[PDB]
Motif scaffolding. Structure first.
Motif, PDB file in Angstrom:
ATOM      1  N   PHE A   1      -4.023  -9.520 -24.652  1.00  0.00           N
ATOM      2  CA  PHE A   1      -4.166 -10.834 -24.664  1.00  0.00           C
ATOM      3  C   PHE A   1      -3.465 -10.924 -26.226  1.00  0.00           C
ATOM      4  O   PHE A   1      -3.606 -10.533 -26.531  1.00  0.00           O
ATOM      5  N   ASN A   2      -3.788 -12.205 -26.641  1.00  0.00           N
ATOM      6  CA  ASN A   2      -3.396 -12.641 -27.528  1.00  0.00           C
ATOM      7  C   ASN A   2      -4.279 -13.818 -28.112  1.00  0.00           C
ATOM      8  O   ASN A   2      -4.286 -15.327 -27.782  1.00  0.00           O
ATOM      9  N   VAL A   3      -5.435 -13.331 -29.434  1.00  0.00           N
ATOM     10  CA  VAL A   3      -6.338 -14.324 -29.417  1.00  0.00           C
ATOM     11  C   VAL A   3      -5.288 -15.762 -30.303  1.00  0.00           C
ATOM     12  O   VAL A   3      -5.818 -16.447 -30.328  1.00  0.00           O
ATOM     13  N   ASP A   4      -5.717 -15.367 -31.515  1.00  0.00           N
ATOM     14  CA  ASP A   4      -5.618 -15.696 -33.051  1.00  0.00           C
ATOM     15  C   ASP A   4      -3.793 -15.703 -32.842  1.00  0.00           C
ATOM     16  O   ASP A   4      -3.596 -14.814 -32.421  1.00  0.00           O
ATOM     17  N   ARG A   5      -3.138 -15.784 -33.951  1.00  0.00           N
ATOM     18  CA  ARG A   5      -1.851 -15.663 -34.653  1.00  0.00           C
ATOM     19  C   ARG A   5      -2.015 -14.060 -34.929  1.00  0.00           C
ATOM     20  O   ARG A   5      -1.122 -13.216 -34.912  1.00  0.00           O
ATOM     21  N   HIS A   6      -3.414 -13.441 -35.289  1.00  0.00           N
ATOM     22  CA  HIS A   6      -3.127 -11.960 -35.997  1.00  0.00           C
ATOM     23  C   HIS A   6      -3.766 -11.173 -35.479  1.00  0.00           C
ATOM     24  O   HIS A   6      -4.120  -9.848 -35.334  1.00  0.00           O
ATOM     25  N   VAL A   7      -4.536 -11.744 -34.561  1.00  0.00           N
ATOM     26  CA  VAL A   7      -5.559 -11.076 -33.846  1.00  0.00           C
ATOM     27  C   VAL A   7      -5.731 -10.760 -32.352  1.00  0.00           C
ATOM     28  O   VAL A   7      -5.090 -12.040 -31.612  1.00  0.00           O
ATOM     29  N   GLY A   8      -5.360  -9.587 -31.798  1.00  0.00           N
ATOM     30  CA  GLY A   8      -5.353  -9.308 -29.910  1.00  0.00           C
ATOM     31  C   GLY A   8      -6.356  -8.511 -29.343  1.00  0.00           C
ATOM     32  O   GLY A   8      -7.408  -8.410 -30.356  1.00  0.00           O
ATOM     33  N   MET A   9      -6.023  -8.571 -28.098  1.00  0.00           N
ATOM     34  CA  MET A   9      -7.447  -8.456 -26.961  1.00  0.00           C
ATOM     35  C   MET A   9      -6.856  -7.447 -25.918  1.00  0.00           C
ATOM     36  O   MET A   9      -5.285  -8.052 -25.506  1.00  0.00           O
ATOM     37  N   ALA A  10      -7.563  -6.749 -25.715  1.00  0.00           N
ATOM     38  CA  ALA A  10      -7.071  -5.425 -24.790  1.00  0.00           C
ATOM     39  C   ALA A  10      -8.279  -5.550 -23.868  1.00  0.00           C
ATOM     40  O   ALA A  10      -8.843  -4.897 -24.257  1.00  0.00           O
ATOM     41  N   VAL A  11      -8.261  -5.831 -22.748  1.00  0.00           N
ATOM     42  CA  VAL A  11      -9.223  -5.748 -21.619  1.00  0.00           C
ATOM     43  C   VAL A  11      -9.285  -4.121 -21.064  1.00  0.00           C
ATOM     44  O   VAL A  11      -7.753  -3.692 -20.217  1.00  0.00           O
TER      45      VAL A  11
ATOM     46  N   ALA B   1     -12.799 -11.297 -18.506  1.00  0.00           N
ATOM     47  CA  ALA B   1     -11.675 -11.262 -19.172  1.00  0.00           C
ATOM     48  C   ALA B   1     -10.978 -12.083 -19.622  1.00  0.00           C
ATOM     49  O   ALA B   1     -11.661 -12.289 -20.970  1.00  0.00           O
ATOM     50  N   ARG B   2     -10.018 -12.620 -18.917  1.00  0.00           N
ATOM     51  CA  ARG B   2      -9.641 -13.945 -19.657  1.00  0.00           C
ATOM     52  C   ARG B   2     -10.301 -15.303 -19.883  1.00  0.00           C
ATOM     53  O   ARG B   2     -10.565 -16.056 -20.554  1.00  0.00           O
ATOM     54  N   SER B   3     -11.559 -14.920 -19.306  1.00  0.00           N
ATOM     55  CA  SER B   3     -12.693 -15.963 -19.268  1.00  0.00           C
ATOM     56  C   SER B   3     -12.499 -15.870 -20.721  1.00  0.00           C
ATOM     57  O   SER B   3     -13.457 -16.570 -21.685  1.00  0.00           O
ATOM     58  N   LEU B   4     -13.290 -14.717 -20.746  1.00  0.00           N
ATOM     59  CA  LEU B   4     -13.871 -13.561 -22.261  1.00  0.00           C
ATOM     60  C   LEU B   4     -13.192 -14.199 -23.746  1.00  0.00           C
ATOM     61  O   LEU B   4     -13.145 -14.514 -24.653  1.00  0.00           O
ATOM     62  N   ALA B   5     -11.483 -14.435 -22.816  1.00  0.00           N
ATOM     63  CA  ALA B   5     -10.255 -14.890 -23.826  1.00  0.00           C
ATOM     64  C   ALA B   5     -10.183 -16.263 -24.350  1.00  0.00           C
ATOM     65  O   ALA B   5      -9.666 -16.088 -25.279  1.00  0.00           O
ATOM     66  N   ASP B   6     -10.863 -17.151 -23.395  1.00  0.00           N
ATOM     67  CA  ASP B   6     -10.931 -18.397 -23.680  1.00  0.00           C
ATOM     68  C   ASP B   6     -11.811 -18.723 -24.780  1.00  0.00           C
ATOM     69  O   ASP B   6     -11.035 -19.268 -25.488  1.00  0.00           O
ATOM     70  N   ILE B   7     -13.175 -17.984 -24.687  1.00  0.00           N
ATOM     71  CA  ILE B   7     -14.313 -18.566 -25.731  1.00  0.00           C
ATOM     72  C   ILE B   7     -13.529 -17.935 -26.915  1.00  0.00           C
ATOM     73  O   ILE B   7     -14.059 -18.301 -28.464  1.00  0.00           O
ATOM     74  N   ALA B   8     -13.067 -16.629 -27.509  1.00  0.00           N
ATOM     75  CA  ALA B   8     -12.941 -15.715 -28.248  1.00  0.00           C
ATOM     76  C   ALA B   8     -11.288 -17.304 -29.099  1.00  0.00           C
ATOM     77  O   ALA B   8     -11.410 -16.999 -30.214  1.00  0.00           O
ATOM     78  N   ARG B   9     -10.622 -17.451 -28.374  1.00  0.00           N
ATOM     79  CA  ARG B   9      -9.221 -18.379 -29.261  1.00  0.00           C
ATOM     80  C   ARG B   9      -9.898 -19.267 -29.412  1.00  0.00           C
ATOM     81  O   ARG B   9      -9.674 -20.086 -30.291  1.00  0.00           O
ATOM     82  N   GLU B  10     -11.096 -20.614 -28.503  1.00  0.00           N
ATOM     83  CA  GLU B  10     -11.554 -21.472 -29.172  1.00  0.00           C
ATOM     84  C   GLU B  10     -12.308 -21.272 -29.999  1.00  0.00           C
ATOM     85  O   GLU B  10     -12.930 -21.786 -31.036  1.00  0.00           O
ATOM     86  N   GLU B  11     -12.997 -19.782 -30.334  1.00  0.00           N
ATOM     87  CA  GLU B  11     -14.048 -19.748 -31.479  1.00  0.00           C
ATOM     88  C   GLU B  11     -13.351 -19.244 -32.880  1.00  0.00           C
ATOM     89  O   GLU B  11     -14.044 -20.299 -34.474  1.00  0.00           O
TER      90      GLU B  11
ATOM     91  N   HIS C   1       0.061 -10.982 -34.776  1.00  0.00           N
ATOM     92  CA  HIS C   1       0.508 -10.610 -33.024  1.00  0.00           C
ATOM     93  C   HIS C   1       1.585 -10.024 -31.896  1.00  0.00           C
ATOM     94  O   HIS C   1       2.017 -12.000 -31.800  1.00  0.00           O
ATOM     95  N   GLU C   2       2.238  -9.296 -31.723  1.00  0.00           N
ATOM     96  CA  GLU C   2       3.499  -9.632 -31.298  1.00  0.00           C
ATOM     97  C   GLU C   2       3.750  -7.879 -29.901  1.00  0.00           C
ATOM     98  O   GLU C   2       2.762  -7.328 -30.417  1.00  0.00           O
ATOM     99  N   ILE C   3       4.182  -8.385 -29.107  1.00  0.00           N
ATOM    100  CA  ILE C   3       5.026  -6.956 -28.244  1.00  0.00           C
ATOM    101  C   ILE C   3       5.295  -6.472 -28.473  1.00  0.00           C
ATOM    102  O   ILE C   3       6.678  -6.514 -29.765  1.00  0.00           O
ATOM    103  N   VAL C   4       5.569  -4.762 -28.558  1.00  0.00           N
ATOM    104  CA  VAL C   4       6.820  -4.016 -29.303  1.00  0.00           C
ATOM    105  C   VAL C   4       8.394  -4.464 -28.980  1.00  0.00           C
ATOM    106  O   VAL C   4       7.787  -5.414 -26.945  1.00  0.00           O
ATOM    107  N   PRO C   5       8.952  -4.683 -29.195  1.00  0.00           N
ATOM    108  CA  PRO C   5      10.430  -4.559 -28.860  1.00  0.00           C
ATOM    109  C   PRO C   5      11.028  -3.678 -27.399  1.00  0.00           C
ATOM    110  O   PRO C   5       9.707  -2.623 -27.001  1.00  0.00           O
ATOM    111  N   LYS C   6      11.790  -4.037 -26.623  1.00  0.00           N
ATOM    112  CA  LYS C   6      12.583  -3.254 -25.698  1.00  0.00           C
ATOM    113  C   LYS C   6      12.055  -2.050 -25.854  1.00  0.00           C
ATOM    114  O   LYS C   6      12.345  -1.231 -24.953  1.00  0.00           O
TER     115      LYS C   6
END
Ligand SMILES: Nc1ncnc2c1ncn2[C@@H]1O[C@H](COP(=O)(O)OP(=O)(O)OP(=O)(O)O)[C@@H](O)[C@H]1O
Ligand SMILES: [Mg+2]
Lengths: 40, 105, 239, 232, 240, 250, 209, 240
Positions: free
Chosen positions: E63-73, E80-90, E220-225
């Motif tokens: 996932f992608n929580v903030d502009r600089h924070v990342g999440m892997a579940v 998992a994406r329920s916790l990703a919503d409140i962390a993005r909201e926090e 935070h972003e994905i690697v290039p191909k």
């Protein structure tokens, strides 16, 4: 406890080696049997 | 009142003073009343040997059964042992006077 | 806030708390009611007096209005709060639509109060049945009853309480047209009916007639002694 | 969140509230405590043994004041006691903010016991596990009251709660009368706590508070050693 | 039994089984590893191809929580994406109240207390997810945290969650992440998830990588191909 | 959460309900109170339970509670549940007086409380009150009245009722000795000491074991008087004098 | 099958005596309390040899009294707990409707706690008729006083109708308890007839205690 | 000994006991960890060990010492997820004392507010009563240093020497023999007698990387955590 006293009253006359049970042996015996009444 | 233990003392103290003032059967009665009182106290720790002496005094004051009166002063001395040296040394007197009275020298 | 489903379905389709409440009705005292063409007559039996109590505080015939009486059976604790909610509704009708309450209208209020109460959360159903008797406007005497599940239901003669199957089986062999001929003759049907029930030999019965224009009128135990004499006197001579 | 909203205290088929019966067994397994009123003031005394020498005995207190003239001890479990102390501290204040008068000792027990009854019927709670002894001198005459986890209360001359309370009440019956001073009541209250204590009763194994017409106060351990001296 | 139905009852030896039962649901999700380099954090998720019918890029476990924070579940994906919503909201309420980007020692503290609050009551169940958080700051460096379903959080130089957890972090400590930049790491993240999950249990799988640091300028972003094709060029050299 | 619920509100499959019948089983033991009236006045005779030799004997009564300015009640059962009901109908009578500026009739005070008591038997998931209680009083509509409440919530008017431990033994003797409207408030006092002579197993009728309070109508007073322990024992021996004569002469 | 249920003391055991009076079949009786044993497996063994005896004689009647007592009371003599009571009931549940050829054996059962026992045992096929006993009515109570005071020298002081509504729900067992105890008060004074004050102090002794 | 649901929720046994609380005291022991606190003449020392099993885990995030206020520190035993939630309450309750009352909270008044919160969990039949312990130290004026323990039953008391954890009973038997010989206690002696407590109970003879020491003193009342260099200063002086 009446027989608990009167049988034990003979022991007082026996532990001082008498052959007749006296009236002060019973009042010595009541105070021991009713002590266990005061125990639990 | 509340106390039971101090009744043993004043009955035993009156048992001292009718015999010293020469009244044996009333001293027999007050001694007996302290027998039937001390039969209900859980701790007569030292007062037993105090009562064991004058149980032997008045029973030897009539000279009926020297052998059992000897047995009181034995137990009156075993209680007095190594805790009360004034009362222990007089306790040898009453056991050995009775033993001479027993005619086993 | 106690939120729990009390009344639930069975695996064969019954509501157990409803039909357990119908057995609480089945050991309350017997209440019988018939209607004549001009005067209705209903009366409880089994007063069960103990001759040391106030006779008025034990009554089970009460009035909701001038025109509407009410009898019941079951347990008396739940009864007198259904009555006190029905007195409020039949009074607030008069602040609305100006005529007095028709006897059919007040039974739809009671039955709908009793139904939705077997539907809510954390409420056991009521354990009473009722007989609502009234002569409405334009002088049409009629009566109704109320099952504890809440099904209002009109009748010509009915009986609830302990010993209701025997009395209803007695009325079907006895309710003729000429039994409601006279006003004193319809009462002889009820006193013959309650005597064919739990004993009540003139000392445990309390009829209450209504002549379509008065209020309720309890006769004291002198005419009941007079009626039970002649009800046995006709049976004394025919057999 | 929310609660349970159902009573977990029901009637037995024998007609006994079982949880209140079990809560009294927790009261009987508590520390022993005696309380005696005598003609000018009330003496409350309790029995406080630390489990080891590491504990600081001058940190917590059993005997607690409620106001200028009302003290309170217990015999039960610890943390349930501090709840209804703080509740009783506040109830004396809403009485005072209305009437501008210190609360009578009878009216305080009306309101503490009404908490415990309300607490043994409501949803999702177990009852308290303490009994109380409440003293005070309102309008000259002293008072001594005792509540229970059920919510009832009584008016005692002298009583005992905790372990061996059936032996304490027989001891008080052969000792207490109507005519004693306050300092005579102190000597017979230490004499009845000596019936069930350990070997040594020092100035910190017990804790005694008194009432006078001068008000409630709690004894410092200096003069508690003086009363413990010349005892038994 | 009967001591393991609610989350409000201790055992007669003093542990909650509803938390331990919910931890057991994590070891059916596959594998999510993440190690931090000298100057950044690299996540890595190996992704099972269940059937041919799904689309490449479906149901991302990263996932992608903030502009600089990342999440892997790793766990039950709905939780998992329920916790990703409140962390993005926090993280939104931190910036709207305090003005700046949320730090990780506070962000993982606020989420773990929210996870802990469901292990106290009978009205709710515990979550069935474990996950990782990683970020990079220019005033703080790289951070890497991990949260279990009980609510316990710690820092790591590299961690792993999934089926083969011990079999994955065996080879992580063979690396030297204290000195490597986050370019050589990307080849070494992919290699250690190739030696795991033999082709007997799974037919085919999918690599999914993530990437953060000052080389990504803090975002935070994905690697290039092309970079992950080099790691998949670095795939079949583990057979020697 | 639904595993721990005890369901204190549902019926039983036999039709009745268990929870108040256990409470009416507990109302059988633990106390004895009775009342009687036939003329000017009505009395409550209650039997004290805790007769231990260390109590202060204060608060003007033990089981008698003055509710209004002209009525009072005697209580039985769980005493902690009793104190909450007493100060609940005590301000029902005051909010009536606030609303109408007139003292409350004695009957519709009972119906107000017995609707509160009925509601716990009916919803809420709540333990009912294990309290039954009597009611004496006066009003201008019917005069002296006497009522009885039940934990189920149904009441009734009476002339003589006991809720003691041997209440059924007492009621069987009350309807053997009575007269409707002629038992004045000395024969009623004489009949009260005779009944609790029987139902109390502790013999000889110690004057501190009972409590008696009367409610007599003085013109604007309605005097509620708890009679003191100096005139009980003369009423005790007055029963004891006649019973030696009535036995020996038969 | 026939089961008899009602309040205690209304005449359940009394009617089974009348059947044992009339019939010509062999009559077997067992209390339900004595089905439970102290050893494991000894309980269900006793049920198997009860219906062995019943079949090997004749047309016969098996009377089982107080069968709620197998489930209500727990006894510490029984080694197995409630899950040995259950295995006993499974054997009894067989013997009423097994697949073996039953023969001519009738079963009469009696209890007063009918809601407690297993409904698998009360299904039609094992028990067909279910008979309720009510409390005696106030005109049937007067019949019972006529029966139990038939052959006694009843003095004409008494009126039976005052005795009827003394208790509102007195059983038939209460009536015989008053009538026997009132006769015992006569023999304290060597009398031959029973007066009114005998019954006055009878119900004080029987009912109210 | 048991009747009803008394094994499951917080209600009374027939013996007067209640089992869900005394099941929770031995949930402290599942950490496998022990802490020792000793009060001195002008100081107060907390010492506790830390067990770092992995090289992949960051050793700076496993501190059980927590700074509650600027002058009050604490150590946590028991399970980790409940312990860190309880620190969040104590930081919050101390800030409201300063806002409402305008001065620094005393350490015993803080321990009373924590025990009252923990009392409610064993008071309602719905919540789980937080199986972790609590030890506070601090300097109070006209009282010197003072140490308090709060357990999950709601009980608290002031101590002079304190142990909590797996080896609690063996350590208190050690310390009560140490204190009743009535030696005076300087700063370095209280540090020496607290390290040698758990060094002889656990029988480790450790190096400075496994323990951590918080301290407060009436010359610098700040709660401060010792450096591994200056822990080593005390540690080599302990071996004479
Ligand atoms: N209806 C009745 N007619 C005649 N006698 C009766 C009646 N009811 C009870 N009795 C008397 O009561 C006594 C006991 O009756 P019985 O024991 O049969 O009642 P039960 O209901 O079987 O008792 P239980 O419930 O204890 O088994 C009998 O001896 C009988 O004399
Ligand atoms: Mg029978």
């Amino acid at each position: 406890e009446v027989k608990g006293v009167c049988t034990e009253a003979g022991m007082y006359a026996l532990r001082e080696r008498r052959v007749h049970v006296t009236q002060e042996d019973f009042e010595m015996a009541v105070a021991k049997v009713m002590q266990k009444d005061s125990e639990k | 009142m509340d106390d039971k233990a101090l009744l043993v003392e004043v009955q035993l103290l009156e048992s001292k003073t009718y015999h010293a003032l020469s009244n044996l059967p009333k001293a027999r009665a007050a001694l007996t009343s302290a027998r039937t009182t001390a039969n209900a106290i859980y701790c007569p720790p030292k007062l037993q040997a105090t009562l064991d002496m004058q149980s032997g005094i008045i029973h030897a004051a009539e000279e009926k059964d020297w052998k059992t009166a000897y047995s009181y002063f034995y137990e009156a001395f075993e209680g007095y042992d190594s805790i009360d040296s004034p009362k222990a040394i007089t306790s040898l007197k009453y056991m050995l006077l009775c033993k001479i009275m027993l005619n086993t020298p | 806030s106690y939120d729990r489903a009390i009344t639930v379905f069975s695996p064969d389709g019954h509501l157990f708390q409803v039909e357990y409440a119908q057995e609480a009705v089945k050991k309350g005292s017997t209440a019988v009611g018939v209607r004549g063409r001009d005067i209705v007559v209903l009366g409880v039996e089994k007063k069960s007096v103990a001759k040391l109590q106030d006779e008025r505080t034990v009554r089970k015939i009460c009035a909701l209005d001038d025109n509407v009486c009410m009898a019941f059976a079951g347990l008396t604790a739940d009864a007198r709060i259904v009555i006190n909610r029905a007195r409020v509704e039949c009074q607030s009708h008069r602040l609305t639509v100006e005529d007095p309450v028709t006897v059919e209208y007040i039974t739809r209020y009671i039955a709908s109060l009793k139904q939705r109460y077997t539907q809510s959360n954390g409420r056991r159903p009521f354990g009473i049945s009722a007989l609502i008797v009234g002569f409405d406007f334009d002088g049409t005497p009629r009566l109704y009853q109320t099952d504890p599940s809440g099904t209002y239901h009109a009748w010509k003669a009915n009986a609830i309480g302990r010993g209701a199957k025997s009395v209803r089986e007695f009325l079907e062999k006895n309710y003729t047209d000429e039994a409601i001929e006279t006003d004193d003759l319809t009462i002889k049907l009820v006193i013959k009916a309650l005597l064919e029930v739990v004993q009540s030999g003139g000392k445990n019965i309390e009829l209450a007639v209504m002549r379509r224009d008065q209020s309720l009128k309890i006769l004291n135990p002198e005419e009941i002694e007079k009626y039970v004499a002649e009800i046995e006197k006709e049976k004394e001579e025919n057999e | 969140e929310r609660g349970y909203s159902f009573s977990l205290t029901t009637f037995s088929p024998s007609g006994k509230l079982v949880q209140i019966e079990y809560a009294l067994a927790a009261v009987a397994g508590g520390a022993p405590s005696v309380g005696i009123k005598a003609a000018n003031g009330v003496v409350l005394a309790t029995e406080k043994k630390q489990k080891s020498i590491l504990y600081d005995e001058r940190s917590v207190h059993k005997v607690e004041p409620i106001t200028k003239h009302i003290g309170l001890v217990y015999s039960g479990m610890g943390p349930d006691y501090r709840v209804l102390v703080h509740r009783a501290r506040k109830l004396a204040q809403q009485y005072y903010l209305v009437y501008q008068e210190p609360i009578p000792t009878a009216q305080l027990v009306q309101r503490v016991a009404s908490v415990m009854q309300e607490y043994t019927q409501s949803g999702g709670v177990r009852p308290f596990g303490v009994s109380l002894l409440i003293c005070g001198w309102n309008e000259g005459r002293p008072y001594l009251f005792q509540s229970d986890p059920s919510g009832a209360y009584f008016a005692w001359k002298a009583t005992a709660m905790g372990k061996n309370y059936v032996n304490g009440k027989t001891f008080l019956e052969k000792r207490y009368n109507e005519d004693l001073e306050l300092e005579d009541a102190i000597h017979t209250a230490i004499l009845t706590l000596k019936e069930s204590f350990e070997g040594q009763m020092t100035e910190d194994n017990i804790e005694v508070g008194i009432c006078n017409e001068a008000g409630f106060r709690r004894l410092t351990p200096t003069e508690v050693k003086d009363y413990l001296a010349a005892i038994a | 039994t009967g001591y393991d139905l609610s989350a409000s009852t201790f055992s007669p030896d003093g542990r909650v089984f509803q938390v331990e039962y919910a931890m057991k649901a994590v070891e059916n999700s596959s594998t999510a590893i993440g190690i931090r380099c000298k100057d950044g954090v690299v996540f890595g998720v190996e992704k099972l191809v269940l059937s041919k019918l799904y689309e490449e890029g479906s149901n991302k476990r990263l996932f992608n929580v903030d502009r600089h924070v990342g999440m892997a579940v790793a766990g039950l994906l709905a939780d998992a994406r329920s916790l990703a919503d409140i962390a993005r909201e926090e993280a939104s309420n931190f910036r709207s109240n305090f003005g700046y980007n949320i730090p990780l020692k506070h962000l993982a503290d606020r989420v773990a207390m929210y996870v802990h609050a469901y292990t106290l009551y009978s009205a709710v169940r515990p979550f069935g997810c474990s996950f990782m958080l990683g970020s990079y700051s220019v005033n703080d460096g790289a951070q890497l945290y991990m949260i279990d379903p009980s609510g316990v959080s710690y820092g790591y130089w590299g961690c792993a969650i999934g089926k083969a957890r011990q079999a994955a972090k065996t080879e992580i400590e063979k690396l030297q992440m204290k000195e490597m930049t986050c370019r050589d790491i990307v080849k070494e993240v992919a290699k250690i998830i190739y030696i795991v999950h033999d082709e007997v249990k799974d037919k085919a799988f999918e690599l999914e990588l993530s990437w953060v640091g000052e080389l990504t300028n803090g975002r935070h972003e994905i690697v290039p191909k092309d970079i992950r094709e080099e790691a998949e060029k670095y795939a079949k050299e583990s057979l020697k | 959460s639904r595993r721990y619920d005890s369901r204190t509100t549902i019926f039983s499959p036999e039709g009745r309900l268990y929870q108040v019948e256990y409470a009416m089983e507990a109302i059988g033991h633990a106390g004895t109170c009775l009342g009687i009236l036939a003329n000017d006045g009505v009395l409550l005779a209650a039997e004290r339970r805790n007769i231990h030799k260390l109590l202060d004997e204060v608060f003007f009564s033990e089981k008698i509670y003055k509710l209004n300015e002209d009525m009072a009640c005697s209580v039985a059962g769980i005493t902690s549940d009793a104190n909450v009901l007493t100060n609940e109908l005590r301000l029902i009578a005051q909010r009536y007086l606030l609303q109408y500026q007139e003292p409350i009739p004695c009957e519709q005070l009972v119906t107000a409380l017995c609707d509160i008591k009925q509601a716990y038997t009916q919803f809420g998931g709540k333990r009912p009150f294990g309290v039954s209680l009597l009611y004496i009083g006066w009003d201008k509509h019917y005069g002296f009245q006497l009522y009885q409440s039940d934990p189920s919530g149904n009441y009734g008017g009476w002339k003589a009722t006991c809720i003691g431990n041997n209440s059924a033994a007492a009621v069987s003797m009350l309807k053997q000795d009575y007269k409707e409207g002629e038992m004045t408030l000395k024969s009623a006092l004489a009949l009260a000491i005779k009944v609790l002579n029987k139902t109390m197993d502790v013999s000889k009728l110690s004057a501190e074991k009972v409590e008696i309070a009367t409610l007599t109508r003085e013109n604007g007073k309605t005097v509620i008087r708890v009679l003191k322990q100096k005139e009980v024992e003369q009423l005790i021996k007055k029963h004891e004098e006649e019973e030696a004569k009535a036995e020996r002469e038969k | 099958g026939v089961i008899l249920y009602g309040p205690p003391g209304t005449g359940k055991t009394l009617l089974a005596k009348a059947v044992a009076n009339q019939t010509s079949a062999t009559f077997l009786r067992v209390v339900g309390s004595e089905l439970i044993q102290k050893y494991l497996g000894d309980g269900p063994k006793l049920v198997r040899e009860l219906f062995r005896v019943a079949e090997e004689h004749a047309p016969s009647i098996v009377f089982i009294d107080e069968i709620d007592a197998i489930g209500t009371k727990r006894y510490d003599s029984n080694s197995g707990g409630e899950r040995e009571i259950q295995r006993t009931m499974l054997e009894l549940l067989n013997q009423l409707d097994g697949f073996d050829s039953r023969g001519d054996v009738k079963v009469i059962m009696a209890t007063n706690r009918i809601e407690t026992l297993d409904p698998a045992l009360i299904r039609p096929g094992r028990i067909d008729r279910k008979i309720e006993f009510p409390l005696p009515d106030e005109k049937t109570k007067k019949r019972i006083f006529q029966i139990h005071t038939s052959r006694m020298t009843l003095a004409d002081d008494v009126t039976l109708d005052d005795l009827i509504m003394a208790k509102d729900d007195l059983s038939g067992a209460d009536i015989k308890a008053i009538c026997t105890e009132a006769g015992l008060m006569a023999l304290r004074e060597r009398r031959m007839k029973v007066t009114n004050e005998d019954f006055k102090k009878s119900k004080e002794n029987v009912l109210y205690k | 000994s048991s009747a009803g649901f008394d094994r499951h929720i917080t209600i009374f046994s027939p013996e007067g006991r209640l089992y869900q609380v005394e099941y929770a005291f031995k949930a402290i022991n599942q950490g496998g960890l022990t802490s020792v606190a000793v009060r001195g003449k002008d100081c107060a020392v907390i010492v506790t060990q830390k067990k770092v099993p992995d090289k992949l885990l960051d050793s700076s995030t496993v501190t059980h010492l927590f700074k509650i206020t600027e002058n009050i520190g604490c150590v946590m035993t028991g399970m980790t997820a409940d312990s860190r939630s309880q620190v969040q309450r104590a930081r919050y309750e101390a800030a409201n004392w300063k806002y409402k009352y305008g001065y620094e909270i005393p350490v015993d008044m803080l321990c009373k507010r924590i025990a009252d919160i923990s009392q409610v969990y064993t008071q309602n039949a719905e919540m789980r009563p937080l199986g972790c312990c609590m030890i506070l130290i601090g300097i109070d004026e006209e009282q010197g240093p003072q140490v308090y323990k709060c357990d999950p039953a709601g009980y608290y008391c002031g101590f002079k020497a304190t142990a909590a954890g797996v080896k609690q009973t063996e350590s208190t038997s050690f310390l009560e023999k140490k204190v009743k010989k009535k030696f005076d206690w300087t700063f370095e002696q209280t540090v020496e007698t607290a390290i040698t407590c758990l060094s002889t109970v656990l029988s480790i003879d450790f190096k400075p990387s496994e323990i951590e020491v918080g301290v407060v003193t009436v010359e610098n009342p700040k709660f401060r955590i010792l450096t591994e260099a200056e822990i080593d200063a005390h540690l080599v002086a302990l071996a004479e």
